[PDB]
Design a protein around this nucleic acid. Structure first.
Ligand SMILES: [Zn+2]
Lengths: 157, 105, 53, 47, 48
DNA sequence: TATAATGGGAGCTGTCACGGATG
DNA sequence: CATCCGTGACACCAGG
């Protein structure tokens, strides 16, 4: 509920690609290789893996075991993925303790968590790069600027 | 957050999966009944659904029997996810609408 | 505000960030109509006595 | 008297909040929809 | 035997002597109600 | 209203997260 | 782009 980076944080892929393991007797790394890109994820030697070598992993798919950083999942895979993840992970606890509870309420709260956005390009507006505001307000401003024919604001969730 | 209107007219929705990947990474197995019920019961269908010879119309409030029917359909391989109105996708300002929220449980 | 807007076009990320942080306060004072100096007190108010009996 | 209870008015603790904020050099202003000030103190504190 | 009917309890019941105390939490000290009453100085709210 | 006097003195013992400062 | 640090916050009623 606080959207905190977990202590036992799982490592997720920033892009798509194929798995290439490279494990020396003393160190370990995982490489996701695209058609023309390659990402290196140097992780400690004793971390559990979820990726069989030479597999195709989605962006934001977990490589290591553990809890996913919701902000990393947001950057990698987008808002729908984070909403799915938060709702399911909270429900896991509640089902484990034997508590029946409707996704409706958790979704309400998550909706309030996804309430704001961050400007990446002000366009023709008075806003600033990095300024935080509400999704509703930036969408209203962008609709008014598209009506005026101006460049809308580029915003990130 | 209050129910402030009857319908925000959104065309967006979420898809409640009826299957989850096995921890063996072997296949997809059916979710537990209670989980599907907590995901679907009392909700409004965002799209037409035709399973086991029954028409579940858009705008229908899924009763518990509708949920058991959808579970039966998924068991017979006719459906893998249910499109549904949800507060995640409601566009009512300062709250949600009636269709997106669904039942008063 | 103009100096900070000029600073907002800098290649450095931290300088852009600090210019934004200053410009948000500047624009708060501008859009509100409050003089910055009012953050300094000349006449300290006194609460009504019945509220501190 | 056997009469139905009246519609309420401003609770005193909100007036206490407003005055304790004024004591912090903060002007709290109850406004109407025209953004014109509304006097919750009924003129008893305006010179 | 059920004292209201004279019929027996359908099963045999555990009966015996037990040591039971009366704790200090008696309702005579706790029942309380108020229509109106004293109010606080600054807040003008009911006392507690 | 006058000798001279010229720099204090406690403190007493969380746990975490977050945002800002520094280094 | 890290570590360090100062400052927040830490359930309800009851009686006290
Ligand atoms: Zn809606």
């Amino acid at each position: 509920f606080e959207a905190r980076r977990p202590k036992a944080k799982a490592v997720i892929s920033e892009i798509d690609g194929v798995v290439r393991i490279e494990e020396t007797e003393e160190k370990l790394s995982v490489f996701v290789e695209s058609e023309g890109f390659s990402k290196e994820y140097k992780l400690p030697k004793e971390a559990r893996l979820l990726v069989k070598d030479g597999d195709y992993v989605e962006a934001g798919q977990p490589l290591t075991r553990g809890a996913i950083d919701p902000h990393q999942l947001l950057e990698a895979k987008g808002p729908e993925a984070v909403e799915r993840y938060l709702v399911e992970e909270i429900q896991k606890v509640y089902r484990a303790q034997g508590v029946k509870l409707h996704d409706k309420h958790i979704e309400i709260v998550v909706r309030q968590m996804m309430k704001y956005v961050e400007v990446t390009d002000p366009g023709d507006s008075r806003l600033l790069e990095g300024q935080v505001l509400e999704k509703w307000d930036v969408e209203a401003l962008n609709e008014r600027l598209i009506a005026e024919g101006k460049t809308p604001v580029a915003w990130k969730p | 957050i209050v129910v402030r209107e009857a319908d925000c007219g959104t065309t967006n929705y979420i898809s409640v999966p009826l299957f989850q990947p096995d921890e063996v990474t072997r296949s997809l197995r059916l979710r537990k009944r209670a989980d599907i019920e907590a995901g679907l019961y009392g909700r409004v269908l965002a799209r037409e659904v035709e399973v086991l010879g029954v028409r579940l119309e858009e705008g229908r409030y899924l009763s518990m029997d509708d949920v058991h029917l959808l579970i039966k359909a998924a068991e017979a391989g006719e459906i893998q996810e249910v499109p549904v109105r949800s507060p995640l996708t409601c566009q009512t300002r300062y709250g949600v609408c009636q269709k997106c929220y669904g039942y008063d449980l | 505000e103009k100096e900070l807007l000029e600073e907002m076009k800098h290649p450095s990320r931290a300088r852009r960030a600090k210019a934004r942080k200053r410009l948000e306060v500047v624009r708060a004072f501008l859009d509100s109509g409050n003089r910055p100096e009012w953050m300094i007190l000349e006449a300290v108010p006194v609460l009504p006595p019945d509220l501190r009996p | 008297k056997g009469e139905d209870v009246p519609e309420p008015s401003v609770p005193e603790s909100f007036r206490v909040l407003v005055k304790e904020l004024q004591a912090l050099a903060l002007d709290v202003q109850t406004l109407d929809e025209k953004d014109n000030p509304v006097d919750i103190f009924e003129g008893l504190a305006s010179k | 035997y059920d004292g209201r009917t004279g019929e027996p309890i359908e099963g045999p019941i555990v009966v015996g002597q037990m040591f039971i105390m009366k704790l200090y939490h008696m309702v005579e000290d706790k029942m309380h109600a108020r229509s109106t009453g004293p109010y606080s100085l600054i807040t003008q709210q009911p006392l507690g």
